[PDB]
Symmetry: C6
Subunit: 69 residues, 6 copies
């Protein structure tokens, strides 16, 4: 309980830090989008931006489910 | 917990603000989606769109879960 | 905050209607590429279809969690 | 509240009816394609099956959350 | 009571076993990453593994959610 | 009773073990990536890292849900 819940919480903060690693790499991938490239590729970039937002939401739910228990 | 909890809603208002930010990019690319012969591109845009609506759902579930702790 | 639960339920059903449209766009798309000779395309079509379904169920969980408040 | 979970049940039962639809479609499509040349296409068969499994599970979570409220 | 969740447990253990099989199929395929060659394929392989990990997790959440009712 | 949760939590521990394995694979393949030609590929490595982050969050949620039941 109390120490694993602490381990869950450093797991959760390690995910936060992983998240800012990806928030930053999709921006670095958006800066590499210049001539507008290939349409399926454009869709790919947008797909990846969507899952980072999904990751963002699952992370808040994980934080909050930790707080709810 | 309310200071921890509202900073979680801080994050979630940033999250709404990003979702709408990306859905307009979907709408923008979804009318410039060139409906040519290859289905693979088409499926990718449909794929990205479902991903955006699921992200949407996760976002509201995240809203609900933090608010009904 | 009955107001916000109301407008949250608003977005919830606003999202239901966009999904029905999403799934309708894909019924058309996947149906009328009249003959298929592609494996990758074929699997992607299944991928989008599955995605839309979890969009479907996450939408339903979003409804239940909202009312479960 | 009485009619509300019936419409939720409506949605949930209609969803079941399509998961099973795509499980049949994935079943026969997934082994009617055996070109076997590049892990790209094979990894797609795999992703789709994985997605089919999460749709199953998410559907069960919706069923059970509805059972929980 | 005990048997209403049995009819549902019946469905969740079909799922575990079918997941039991997809992980077997992907690990053989993950084992056959013949030579090195394309990176896109490499990411697809990784994508597929993360999705069964996702599938595993929602499977266990589905179990616990069913145990909560 | 609580021993049932320990059987479940072990499956989650095996999930935790494989998660870090895939994580180790993803850092490893991102250094062997050494690609800057196609955005498609850059976004693919992004999709896989995003998926890794999500599965990861799902794991924290599953742990908490099992212990909260």
């Amino acid at each position: 309980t109390e120490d694993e819940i602490r381990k869950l919480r450093k797991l959760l903060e390690e995910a936060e830090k992983k998240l800012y690693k990806l928030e930053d790499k999709t921006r670095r991938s958006e800066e590499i989008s210049k001539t507008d490239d290939d349409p399926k590729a454009q869709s790919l970039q947008l797909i990846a931006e969507s899952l980072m937002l999904i990751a963002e939401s699952l992370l808040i739910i994980a934080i909050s489910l930790l707080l709810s228990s």
